[PDB]
Write a protein that binds this ligand. Structure first.
Ligand SMILES: Nc1ncnc2c1ncn2[C@@H]1O[C@H](COP(=O)(O)CP(=O)(O)O)[C@@H](O)[C@H]1O
Ligand SMILES: Nc1ncnc2c1ncn2[C@@H]1O[C@H](COP(=O)(O)CP(=O)(O)O)[C@@H](O)[C@H]1O
Ligand SMILES: [Cl-]
Ligand SMILES: [K+]
Ligand SMILES: [K+]
Ligand SMILES: [Mg+2]
Ligand SMILES: [Mg+2]
Lengths: 315, 312
């Protein structure tokens, strides 16, 4: 019935061309395959949460176009509520044009498009759904002011905020930190936000402390194959949560799998320690890296170990 | 209604992102605008001819996908026959993914897709329409075997062949020249095809002669703002046909406008001199450069000077 996880954020149509070599400036090349995929950090996170069993709702804006209609169907196919998936005639659906060579290297051009037109009126119409959620997740692929509005609304209603400052902006409004219950970013984002080098767990501990002092309640920095680091106002000493070693097929979208899993745990297992939530989220994201693609790689509950769903702390 | 102009060639969806900077390897950048356009050199040429008043037929193959369905509607809206516009589940509609910066530099990735699956069986179904046409137009965006068969069919029925070797490749099948009544390309294509540097109308004349001696009857090299150069087996001395100076808004698709205009004139105004046809085609192409986009820039007869359509 009630959506426990509300994601206010982005949907993007992935337009993928496969080539033998990447083009340089000025070059026309021929590729050998083109296909369409569904992306956007907001939708990616929402899709992972939904596949773990969350009742989710996506607050987003697409175009009144073929891509937008397709995106709505993609959400429905993932059992996501589309009651706040808005459409606009005033911009195309967001796009990621992606060129990939035979080694899996890419160039990407993102046009946020309709995502940027998600506005105050849209959030007001979503106010009841936001207010009744357990967790509100947002990123920085819509207009920053709209993400800030959503954080504000959630905070005012006592709804847990999960903020993923991605892609990062060097001088974020200070309110982004003070309105974030959980602030989760990757190493490259942490570098932009703090002006520190972040390559290692040690580095992430230092960066996390800078972010915590700006007013976050919890800070998590993800570290690829090294797992993640967390600290909080209650426990300000950095804790490194490793992830078990796997053979990565395709790491694309791992960050969004991680965040979607964390949203699921915050909503449905609020009793658990951060450490527990993060061990589980690490494991889920590590499953995603062992499969090709972004949304297509995200696991479903039925294909995951039963231990990930126990109410109490586990070893 | 008998089609006078038959175009056997490509339909492509243009997926255009406008950016401040072009991305380097491994980089994600954010751009400021995305749009979809109808393109493909075959379709572009067919659309310009149709807008001038030609009865046209587009022989092509698109996907059984949204892009393909949309493409078919695009052709119908331009009054083009789609009797031999095929759809396949075996590849997506052709795509051109185009990134452009604010200085107009670009990165382009073409995936010809369904265009490549237009096969000789598909062509043969069109034999009656080809046989009753005045002009057959082909390019180098579908499979070579298919384009060669189309030109062969036209020749067998005494239908004029107009061939646009675009995009160009160094080692083009010799038959493309010998099957071409009119062979029309741009300066950068002529350079690839001949190995000559083309940096003037005089240089274009020299490259054109190489193309002529490979077996073409008429060779036209288009020269952007400098108009075009023509020679023929009957008159091998190069003739430079200037175009009047205009303020270009967007030169994208001008070559296809030029070729589609030329097809229209070859089909419906056969008694005009070649020089006259090229002056008119230059003028129509120069209108196209004064508007943004490709097919959205191609003028209609109703918006053009009446003198372009007077005989003699
Ligand atoms: N190679 C790898 N092996 C195992 N887990 C991985 C992994 N790459 C990523 N992960 C998992 O996915 C989470 C998020 O990944 P990232 O820190 O890589 C985000 P990004 O920096 O690539 O955008 C990690 O914290 C970890 O749990
Ligand atoms: N800047 C410009 N001013 C006027 N006419 C132009 C022009 N650029 C192109 N044209 C017209 O369009 C014709 C074809 O253009 P191009 O020679 O540039 C072929 P392409 O660059 O589209 O491949 C020219 O012969 C000329 O008639
Ligand atoms: Cl920009
Ligand atoms: K993956
Ligand atoms: K134009
Ligand atoms: Mg990673
Ligand atoms: Mg040009």
């Amino acid at each position: 019935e009630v959506a426990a996880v509300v994601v206010v954020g982005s949907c993007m149509t992935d337009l993928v061309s496969l080539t033998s070599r990447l083009p340089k400036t000025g070059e026309t090349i021929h590729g050998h395959k083109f296909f369409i995929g569904f992306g956007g950090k907001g939708a990616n996170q929402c899709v992972q949460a939904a596949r773990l069993g969350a009742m989710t709702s996506m607050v987003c804006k697409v175009g009144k176009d073929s891509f937008g209609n397709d995106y709505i169907e993609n959400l429905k196919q993932n059992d996501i509520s589309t009651e706040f998936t808005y459409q606009t005639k005033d911009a195309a659906t967001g796009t990621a044009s992606i060129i990939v060579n035979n080694e899996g290297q890419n160039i990407i051009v993102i046009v946020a498009g309709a995502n940027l037109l998600l506005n105050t009126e849209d959030l007001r119409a979503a106010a009841n759904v936001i207010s009744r959620a357990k967790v509100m997740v947002c990123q920085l692929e819509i207009t920053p002011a709209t993400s800030l509005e959503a954080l504000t609304m959630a905070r005012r209603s006592g709804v847990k905020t999960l903020f993923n400052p991605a892609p990062a902006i060097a001088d974020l409004d200070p309110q982004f930190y003070t309105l974030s219950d959980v602030f989760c970013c990757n190493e490259s984002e942490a570098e932009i936000l703090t002006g520190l080098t972040v390559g290692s767990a040690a580095d992430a501990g230092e960066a996390a402390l800078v972010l915590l002092k700006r007013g976050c309640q919890v800070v998590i920095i993800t570290l690829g194959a090294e797992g993640c680091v967390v600290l909080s106002q209650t426990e300000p000493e950095p804790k490194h949560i490793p992830t078990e070693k796997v053979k990565a097929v395709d790491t694309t979208g791992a960050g969004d799998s991680f965040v979607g899993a964390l949203a699921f745990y915050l909503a449905y297992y609020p009793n658990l320690s951060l450490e527990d939530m993060l061990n589980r989220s690490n494991f889920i994201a590590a499953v995603s890296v062992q499969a090709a693609g972004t949304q297509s790689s995200y696991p479903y509950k039925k294909d995951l170990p039963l231990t990930l769903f126990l109410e109490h702390h586990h070893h």
